[PDB]
Design an enzyme around this catalytic site. Structure first.
Site, PDB file in Angstrom:
ATOM      1  N   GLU A  11       0.695  -1.828   0.211  1.00 18.95           N
ATOM      2  CA  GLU A  11       0.255  -0.309   0.193  1.00 18.95           C
ATOM      3  C   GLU A  11       0.688   1.220  -0.013  1.00 18.95           C
ATOM      4  OE1 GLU A  11      -3.243  -0.010  -0.160  1.00 18.95           O
ATOM      5  OE2 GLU A  11      -4.297  -2.009   0.378  1.00 18.95           O
ATOM      6  N   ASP A  20      -6.917   6.395  -5.019  1.00 19.54           N
ATOM      7  CA  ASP A  20      -6.529   5.136  -5.090  1.00 19.54           C
ATOM      8  C   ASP A  20      -6.355   4.368  -6.981  1.00 19.54           C
ATOM      9  OD1 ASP A  20      -8.994   3.668  -5.390  1.00 19.54           O
ATOM     10  OD2 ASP A  20      -9.509   2.681  -3.586  1.00 19.54           O
ATOM     11  N   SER A 117     -12.933 -19.849  -6.196  1.00 16.12           N
ATOM     12  CA  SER A 117     -11.418 -19.707  -5.363  1.00 16.12           C
ATOM     13  C   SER A 117     -11.222 -20.711  -3.466  1.00 16.12           C
ATOM     14  CB  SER A 117     -10.628 -18.445  -5.260  1.00 16.12           C
ATOM     15  OG  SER A 117     -10.917 -18.444  -6.291  1.00 16.12           O
ATOM     16  N   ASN A 132      -7.435 -20.389 -10.793  1.00 14.09           N
ATOM     17  CA  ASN A 132      -8.846 -19.678 -10.311  1.00 14.09           C
ATOM     18  C   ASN A 132      -8.649 -18.413  -9.976  1.00 14.09           C
ATOM     19  OD1 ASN A 132     -11.555 -19.619  -8.853  1.00 14.09           O
ATOM     20  ND2 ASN A 132     -12.074 -20.997 -11.082  1.00 14.09           N
TER      21      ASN A 132
END
Ligand SMILES: [Cl-]
EC number: 3.2.1.17
Length: 162
Positions: A11, A20, A117, A132
């Site tokens: 981040e 973002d 998943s 996946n």
């Protein structure tokens, strides 16, 4: 490595309001303020979160406390969610960090949509789960982040971050 170091790498750190990858107002170590287009709304959310009139800027100490709260909230959200908790409890400590990372980025409800998943992860079918997980808008929009998290699920090591 631990979850805090992993998310700090993914981040970054900014002490003034920024946008973002989707354009949402954010501050600190990836702390989402609001999805509203209004910068004034974001500034109001910031003041409420910190407890003072920040005018859009925070200290490093404030960023770290927001971050600790956000990680704690992600973990608590997993543990309260009937779909996520059994998968989380089946994973070893390194793979649990990858799960927290996903919830931190996309929220409890976003990760809960990765149903297929999650079943493969619970069954420890690591290579199949990795393929996946990559068949997702997540991977197509933030591929480097997704590759690091997927590699962590696939291998159970920190090799993607080292
Ligand atoms: Cl990325």
């Amino acid at each position: 490595m631990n979850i805090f170091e992993m998310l700090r790498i993914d981040e970054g750190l900014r002490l003034k309001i920024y946008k973002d990858t989707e354009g949402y107002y954010t501050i600190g170590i990836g702390h989402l303020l609001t999805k509203s287009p209004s910068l004034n709304a974001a500034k109001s959310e910031l003041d409420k979160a910190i407890g003072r009139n920040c005018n859009g800027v925070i200290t490093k100490d404030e960023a770290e406390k927001l971050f600790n709260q956000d990680v704690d909230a992600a973990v608590r959200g997993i543990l309260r969610n009937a779909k996520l908790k059994p998968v989380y409890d089946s994973l070893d400590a390194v793979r649990r960090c990858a799960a927290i990372n996903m919830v931190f980025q996309m929220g409890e409800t976003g990760v809960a949509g990765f149903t297929n998943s999650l079943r493969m992860l619970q069954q420890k079918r690591w290579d199949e789960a990795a393929v996946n997980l990559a068949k997702s808008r997540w991977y197509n929009q933030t591929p480097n982040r997704a590759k690091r998290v997927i590699t962590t699920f696939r291998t159970g090591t920190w090799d993607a971050y080292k």
